[PDB]
Design a protein around this ligand. Sequence first.
Ligand SMILES: C[C@H]1c2ccsc2CCN1C(=O)Cn1nnc2ccccc21
Ligand SMILES: C[C@H]1c2ccsc2CCN1C(=O)Cn1nnc2ccccc21
Lengths: 305, 305
Amino acid sequence: SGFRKMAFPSGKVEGCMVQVTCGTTTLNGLWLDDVVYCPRHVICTSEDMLNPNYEDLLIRKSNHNFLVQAGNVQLRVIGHSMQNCVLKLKVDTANPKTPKYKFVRIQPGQTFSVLACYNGSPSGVYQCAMRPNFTIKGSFLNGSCGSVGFNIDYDCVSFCYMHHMELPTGVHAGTDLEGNFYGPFVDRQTAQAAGTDTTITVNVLAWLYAAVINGDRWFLNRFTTTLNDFNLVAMKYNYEPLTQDHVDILGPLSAQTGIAVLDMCASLKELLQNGMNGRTILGSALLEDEFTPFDVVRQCSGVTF
Amino acid sequence: SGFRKMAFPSGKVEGCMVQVTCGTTTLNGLWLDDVVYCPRHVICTSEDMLNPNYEDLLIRKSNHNFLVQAGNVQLRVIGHSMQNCVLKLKVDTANPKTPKYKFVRIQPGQTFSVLACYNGSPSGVYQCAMRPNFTIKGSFLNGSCGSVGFNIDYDCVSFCYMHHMELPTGVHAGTDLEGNFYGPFVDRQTAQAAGTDTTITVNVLAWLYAAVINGDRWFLNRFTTTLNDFNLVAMKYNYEPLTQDHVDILGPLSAQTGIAVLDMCASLKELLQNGMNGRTILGSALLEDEFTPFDVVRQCSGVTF
Ligand SMILES: C[C@H]1c2ccsc2CCN1C(=O)Cn1nnc2ccccc21
Ligand SMILES: C[C@H]1c2ccsc2CCN1C(=O)Cn1nnc2ccccc21
């Protein structure tokens, strides 16, 4: 027992990280098969950044301008293209360390692991959620651009995130591996509004189930609620609406604990209306929304890769 | 910016995990050079567990009784010895994936990453502290025994922890890699008192520095304190005493923020006496004690391996 914010083992991804240099800028790339993926803003200079013309900037570059280094080994670049906000550099060698992998665009509220890297070298790994407003609350310093987020299912790495920028508000934004931003963001240095964020209700409930499984049970109460009544409360507290699809995905946890989903909603209701009265749940004094129902079951059942 | 509970990249350790089976019990081993390390309780059965006679149990075992499997590859065991609470199985092949490594006994209050494994396969990675009472608050299910904790400095993995057991209170206990338990624990199924635990004061202060660096500054106040006055408060709130050695290690963070260590103590004092008044610091509604001063600087300066 016990419950922690657990990341995927990062080995399969560490083997894919490289450094990509263009002019004076260095950041991280992802080397899969014979293609290196990185943020297209590697080709910008400081003047370029307020409104880069990426098409014009890329035209002034040739294959030999992109320096790609994997540990000590230099890779030879034989083609380049821009897809959306990512650059794809074709190299002459397939990465021998390439895992089975897929590219996925995840949904808001889903979680993934981030391998933070600088100069193509891994620094640390942590678990994140894609916020409902399509930002992530990460830990990234300058030089972390091109760090990726991923999930692993058996032997298969599903890459879902590549880091591009920190917004002036101090949260993070980036793309899928086809170079499409999550959210309304663009790769230029402007103030950019991230929408209203909300709490991921289905995750909080998953985490409450996790707490019961681990024997934190003090917040269980004598009440129940309806989906409609609960959603009135959810809206007041800036929680995402709970749908029957959400209730359905919580089914396995409901079965395991014998606590019906709507009874657990009535617990959550009481916590939202009354707070925690200075108590803790799984070591936390607020309601945690960065564990999916899938995450709770995996951690509580101990799936490996 | 941003601040997360970040684990070391786990790749170097994943390459060292194996499954070790003796009779009906399977758990995890660590394969370094030509030696596999695992918890000695692999040789017990259910009857054995209340007070195993490990010497007598081991005498009934031969090299060929220890089945060691690394992925699909079976290893040949050519020697066995018990050191303290660990078994050391000599195998005929050096692990080709062995990193530069050291074995270290860490101090209470130090942090490390855990790679949770089942049947020799990695499941997840997370960051922990060794509690002042020499327990860890992990996430371990049955079959996780032999999972290890580690730190990495450049290319060198310092192994500090091997998981042995969950206590009836639901916290975790284990050994260094020489098989010496942290704390008073023994590898037999009895009720075992873990001492009074305290909060790791030097870590809380490191984390407050981290919050200032990231722009969470609301708890900074107009006050200062002395080491003696602060320690009166620390004792009332079951915090570890702060020593000048602690003040010294916080020096770099003090320099970076320009906030003297004792002024940050006066902030912490006010938080202990007044609570957080329903506010948060770095996304937390309690005082976090699982980041060392070294951790904060690394994360805030972005060191790689
Ligand atoms: C100005 C901004 C930007 C805006 C549009 S594209 C782009 C690339 C450069 N940039 C960054 O934010 C880079 N970056 N990413 N994560 C960071 C964490 C700490 C510091 C810098 C960081
Ligand atoms: C009975 C106890 C024990 C006590 C003395 S040696 C020993 C080995 C077996 N054991 C464990 O606790 C094993 N274990 N370790 N982490 C766990 C998490 C969830 C469930 C079982 C777990």
